[PDB]
From a paper:
The physiologically important protein [name] is an evolutionary conserved enzyme that belongs to the ubiquitous and ancient α-d-phosphohexomutase superfamily, and it is encoded by the [name] gene. [name] is a key regulator of carbohydrate metabolism in mammalian cells, catalyzing the reversible conversion between α-d-glucose 1-phosphate (G1P) and α-d-glucose 6-phosphate (G6P) via a bisphosphorylated sugar intermediate, α-d-glucose 1,6-bisphoshate (G16P). Isoform 2 of human [name] encodes a protein comprising 580 residues, and it differs from isoform 1 by having a longer and different N-terminal. Here we present three crystal structures of the isoform 2 variant of [name], both as a free enzyme and in complex with substrate and product.
We here publish, for the first time, data for a eukaryotic PGM that show the detailed structures of both the pre- and post-reaction complexes. The metal ions in the two complex crystal structures are most likely Zn2+, due to the crystallization and soaking conditions (see Experimental procedures), rather than Mg2+ that is required for enzymatic activity, explaining the stability of substrate and product complexes for structural studies. The divalent cations in the active sites are in both structures complexed by three conserved Asp residues (Asp306, Asp308, and Asp310) contributed by the D2 metal-binding loop. Only minor differences can be seen when comparing the free protein structure with the complex structures, with D4 rotated 2° or less in the complexes, compared to the free protein structure.
Author numbering: 6 to 480, 483 to 580
Write the structure that this text describes.
């Protein structure tokens, strides 16, 4: 009971704050999605976690750090609870005034972005490796968000890397034990300090659910998913963090059956499966959808910022299309009614399906590089309201992270509005704006410098006067513009180069080659292919059949097979 903990704290007295010596590491550079390593890096290596955490604290100014509030939460993967305890003790020893932590450490990435902005916190620490597998032999990550609720920009992350490279002492409160299970306030008496330290354990779902409740019309959702004539659906949480949100939001408040949700219990190893939503890693969901029983299926990733949208019989609306449908009927969501369409954005590898809705509605569209930085830059300038990434990313400017369950609720709102099946909505959209046949091949973990050699030699081949205008086909395309995609940010003036080789032809079709920044050992080659078609006779056809020429040209030009040794892609989406 609470009384036992209170009396215990009273008898043990004030908790000491102590400095301990440490040695720095070399690979604590936070990437596009924080700092991600294998779990043993954080669980077994001495003071790895402590070094990184204290680097994060040092990256925050002392003024903003004394007395301020910080959100802490994660996707409930292995080691998250222990690392959260360490974060609590260090925060207590580092002048933080209050930690708002999700119950049992559970807090989806959009939930953290939401709470940060709501409680006016100086930032948040997210214990997630996103779509990467968890468990003792899995992966583990730490993502630092700032006061706008979004990821820490390159300045902050670089400061954390620099500080981490030379750090030699940290502060911790080792006698501090905190129960992450019981909701409510939890105060701690610290030695040599006058103000008590506060750990507030909040519901993992409540605030997020309130935000969705003010974004969507939950009456229409209740009538759609709740009644006897309900729209049969199946939501696969992949044993990820979105489980509690699915159950408390869609099932409890919105009234959909409890057997509508599956795998809605977050497991520290994500049930052994890969917490990534796509047709390859969500086989159970597509095969359950293959019997012709539900009209809408959806999957999420580990931390809840990605989503997969499926229709009846397993119909697959690829992310690049999903964001274009949401844009095409964006005014079915009360939130965008309130804000208006501030702008549209997509990453360069993402198909141009959104571009067509932007051109038809006279709305600015920004083709940004891979990553959140540019999307947040645009959102803070009131120049972006809906954005999406091909990597199953969909989000708006309601927060500063992408949001999977938000995209699902948007799809249910537009389903209830248009009163059609997903396949009908998609087909009508294709005939309305034309179809962007899209595919992406991932060649996972190939020996680098073979891939880098393919990129350098490929780019040299692309910049040649005897290249622009050359004929290719496999029973015809002619090169129009080959380059290394550069992007100038129109908000802060930042310039970004490489970002992926582009082959654009005269029919609008594009072949993009990108080296991954998500990877650990070696390198991952990503091949995107995007071909447009308006001839409504050709709007419907098998995309892997419709695209096969462009694929053959992509590997024949890149010499992928001869330089990597691989004969088939690791995953096709
Ligand atoms: O490995 P990549 O391609 O560099 O990065 C990948 O993970 C990132 C973080 O989720 C996403 O923003 C990218 O869209 C995705 O392509
Ligand atoms: Zn994610």
């Amino acid at each position: 009971e609470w009384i036992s903990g209170t009396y215990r704290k009273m008898e043990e007295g004030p908790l000491p704050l102590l400095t301990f010596a440490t040695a720095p590491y070399h690979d604590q550079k936070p990437g596009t999605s924080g700092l991600r390593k294998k779990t043993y890096y954080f669980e077994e290596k001495p003071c790895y976690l402590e070094n990184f955490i204290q680097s994060i604290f040092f990256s925050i100014d002392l003024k903003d750090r004394q007395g301020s509030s910080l959100v802490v939460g994660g996707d409930g993967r292995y080691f998250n609870k222990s690392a959260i305890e360490t974060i609590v003790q260090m925060a207590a020893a580092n002048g933080i005034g209050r930690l708002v932590i999700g119950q049992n450490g559970i807090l989806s990435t959009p939930a953290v972005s939401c709470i940060i902005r709501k409680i006016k916190a100086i930032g948040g620490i997210i214990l997630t490796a996103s779509h990467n597998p968890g468990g003792p032999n899995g992966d583990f990550g730490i993502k630092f968000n700032i006061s706008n609720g979004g990821p820490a920009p390159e300045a902050i992350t670089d400061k954390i890397f620099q500080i981490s490279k030379t750090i030699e002492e940290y502060a911790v409160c080792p006698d501090l034990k905190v129960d992450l299970g019981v909701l409510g306030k939890q105060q701690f008496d610290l030695e040599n300090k006058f103000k008590p330290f506060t750990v507030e354990i909040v519901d993992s779902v409540e605030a997020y659910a309130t935000m969705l409740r003010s974004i969507f019309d939950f009456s229409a959702l209740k009538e759609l998913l709740s009644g006897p004539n309900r729209l049969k659906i199946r939501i696969d949480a992949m044993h990820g963090v979105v489980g509690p949100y699915v159950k408390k939001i869609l099932c409890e408040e919105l009234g959909a059956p409890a057997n509508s949700a599956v795998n809605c219990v977050p497991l520290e190893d994500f049930g052994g499966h890969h917490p990534d939503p796509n047709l390859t890693y969500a086989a159970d969901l597509v095969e359950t959808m293959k019997s012709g029983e539900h009209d809408f299926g959806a999957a999420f990733d580990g931390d809840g910022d990605r989503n997969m949208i499926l229709g009846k019989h397993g119909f697959f609306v690829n992310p690049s299309d999903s964001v274009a449908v949401i844009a095409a009927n964006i005014f079915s969501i009360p939130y965008f009614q309130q804000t208006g369409v501030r702008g549209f954005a997509r990453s360069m590898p993402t198909s141009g399906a959104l571009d067509r809705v932007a051109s038809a509605t006279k709305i600015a569209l920004y083709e940004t590089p891979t990553g959140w930085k540019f999307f947040g830059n645009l959102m803070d300038a009131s120049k972006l309201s809906l954005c999406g990434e091909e990597s199953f990313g969909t989000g708006s400017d309601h927060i500063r992270e992408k949001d999977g369950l938000w995209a699902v609720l948007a799809w249910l709102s537009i389903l209830a509005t248009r009163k059609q099946s997903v396949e009908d909505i998609l087909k009508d959209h294709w005939q309305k704006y034309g179809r962007n046949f899209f595919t992406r091949y991932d060649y996972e973990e190939v020996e680098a410098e073979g891939a880098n050699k393919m990129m350098k030699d490929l780019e040299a081949l692309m910049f040649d006067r005897s290249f622009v205008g050359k004929q290719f086909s496999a029973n015809v395309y002619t090169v129009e513009k080959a380059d290394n995609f550069e992007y100038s940010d129109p908000v802060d003036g930042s310039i970004s180069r490489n970002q992926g080789l582009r082959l654009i032809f005269t029919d609008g079709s594009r072949i993009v080659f990108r080296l991954s920044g998500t990877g650990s050992a070696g390198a991952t080659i990503r091949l995107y292919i995007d071909s447009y078609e308006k001839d409504v006779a050709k709007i419907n056809q098998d995309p892997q059949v419709m695209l096969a020429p462009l694929i053959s040209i992509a590997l024949k030009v890149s010499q992928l097979q001869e330089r990597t040794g691989r004969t088939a892609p690791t995953v096709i989406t």
